[PDB]
C-alpha cells in the first residue's frame with residue numbers, strides 16, 4: 001500500500017488556506033455572478049479515494065496554471081498554491097503500484113467554460129476560487 | 144471610513160457570530176442579519192433570531208450547519224426611521240471559527256482523577272477532545288473517544304499525595320492554534 | 334444501417350466512396366452535422382471545432398456513397414474521452430557532451446480531447462546507442478527531463494510515449510529521434526551539490542576539480558518541470574560570479590516550498606555545462 005508522509009493532512013490544508021488567502025474582492029459584490037456547478041458530491045474504497053483525489057488536484061492545478069489565472073491572482077500565492085499542489089500530487093501519484101474520474105472532469109470543464117462566458121471577470125474568478133474551495137473541503141473529508 | 148468586523152466562534156457548542164463597529168459616529172440601535180451561500184444562487188435568508196436585535200451579535204447554530212460551504216452575510220443597522228449602513232463579509236467555518244473549551248470539573252481520588260466534561264444533550268465538526276494532565280514538569284495529553292450531556296473520562300494510574308492540574312480543550316486542527324481551558328487543580332488522597 | 338466501429342486517437346475518428354459524419358447526444362432526438370467531416374474521401378474525422386463535451390455520450394452516424402447509391406451506418410454509443418488515444422508526443426532533443434536534454438509536448442497542440450487533461454501528461458522513455466542497441470528504459474518522466482551519463486560523440490536514438498495515470502489511458506510511441514552528443518567539454522561541470530544551513534544563512538557547496546574558477550548558480554521553482562510551454566532559470570544573486578567552491582546567502586531569498594538548483598563553472602572564456610539538478614525544500618533544517 002501507499003503511506004503518505006505523516007504530514008499530508010498538513011498539505012491538503014495549506015492548499016485550502018492559500019485558496020483562502022488569494023481572495024481579492026468581497027464575495028458579496030458577486031452574488032449576481034453565482035452558479036450551481038453541480039459537483040459530484042456522491043463521491044465522498046481506498047484506491048478510488050486516491051484516484052478521485054489525484055484526479056482533482058491535477059485539475060485544480062491545471063485550472064490555476066493558466067495564462068489567465070496568472071492575471072487574476074497575485075503571483076506569490078499562485079506559486080505556493082502550485083508548489084503544494086505538485087508536492088501533494090507527486091507522492092500521491094507515487095502510488096502507481098499494482099462516470100468515475102470522468103464525471104469529475106466534465107465538472108471541471110463547466111468551470112473552464114463558465115469563466116470564458118462570464119469573460120474572465122473579477123467576480124467570475126472569485127466564484128470559481130470559492131467554488132473550488134467548497135469542492136476541496138468535501139474532497140478533504142477523506143483521511 | 145466605516146468598517147464592521149466579525150468574530151465567529153463556537154461557545155458552549157452554539158455557533159456565535161458577533162461584530163464590532165469602528166469609526167462610526169452614529170452607532171445604530173437595531174441590527175438585522177442576512178446570510179446566503181455561493182454554491183447555489185439563492186437569496187439572502189434573514190436570521191429571525193437576529194432580526195431587529197439590540198444586542199451586537201447572533202446565534203447561527205441552526206442556520207449554518209455546513210463546514211464545507213461559504214456563508215456570505217450582510218449586516219445592516221438602523222438607528223431611527225433609517226438604514227444607517229450595510230456591510231458584508233463571508234466565513235468558512237473550517238477556517239474562521241474558533242472553538243472555545245467546554246465546561247469541566249475534576250474530582251480527586253487515591254489512585255486516579257475524575258474529569259467530567261459538561262457537554263449538552265442534542266450537527267458536529269471534526270474536533271477532538273483533549274484532557275491535559277499536568278504534574279511536576281509533566282503533561283500527559285489525553286484524548287478520549289467519540290457529546291452526551293455530562294461526559295466522564297477517567298485519568299488513571301495516578302500517584303497519591305501527588306498534585307495534578309487538569310486542562311481541557313477542543314482542537315479542530317494541528318495548524319490553527321487552540322484555546323485552553325482555565326486550570327483546575329486538586330490533590331490526591333493518600 | 335450496419336453498425337460500423339470507430340476508434341479515436343487524439344482529436345480524430347478513424348473508421349476501420351465519400352463520407353458524411355453526423356452525431357446524436359444521449360436522449361437523441363436530433364442529428365448534428367460534423368463540419369469538415371462531410372462528403373470527404375478520407376475516413377478520419379477531425380473535430381477540433383466545438384464538439385465540446387468529448388465527455389458526453391454521443392452516437393455517430395456515417396453516410397457512405399458509392400456511385401449514385403448511399404449506404405447508412407450507425408455506431409454504438411460512446412464517450413470519446415473513454416475511447417481516445419494519446420497520439421505520438423512531440424519531441425525535441427538538445428545535445429551536450431555527456432547529456433541529452435529532452436523537451437516533450439503533446440502533439441496536435443490545443444486539442445479539445447485533452448484540453449484540461451493537458452498538463453496531467455506523464456511520458457515514458459526508451460533510449461539506446463546507435464551502435465550498441467543497448468536500451469535503457471525510463472518511466473513516468475515529466476514533460477522536461479534531461480538524461481545524463483552519456484558517452485560523448487555518440488549517437489543516441491530514442492522514442493517516447495505519453496500516458497495518464499488517473500485515466501489509465503495510454504498511447505502511441507513517437508517516431509524515433511536521434512542526436513549526436515557534442516565533443517567533450519574541457520571544463521567538466523561542477524558536481525556533488527549540497528544545501529545546508531549556517532546560522533540563519535544558506536550555504537551551498539560542490540566539488541570542482543580545477544583551481545582558479547568563477548561559478549554562476551541558478552534556481553527554478555520545483556513544480557515548473559511539469560508544464561511544457563512558456564520557465565526561466567532565475568539566478569540566485571549573491572551567488573553571482575563567486576570565486577570559490579561554496580556560496581552562502583540568507584535563508585530569506587527563498588520563501589517556503591521547493592526549488593531546484595544547478596551550478597556552472599566558467600573561466601571567463603569557455604563555460605562548462607550545468608550540474609545535475611537538486612531538489613531543495615526550504616523546510617530542510
Ligand SMILES: *[C@@H]1O[C@H](CO)[C@@H](O)[C@H](O)[C@H]1NC(C)=O
Nearest residue numbers: 463464488489490511512513
Ligand atoms: C545507425 O547505424 C546504421 C547502421 O547500423 C545506419 O544505417 C544509420 O544511418 C545510423 N543512424 C545514425 C543516425 O547514426
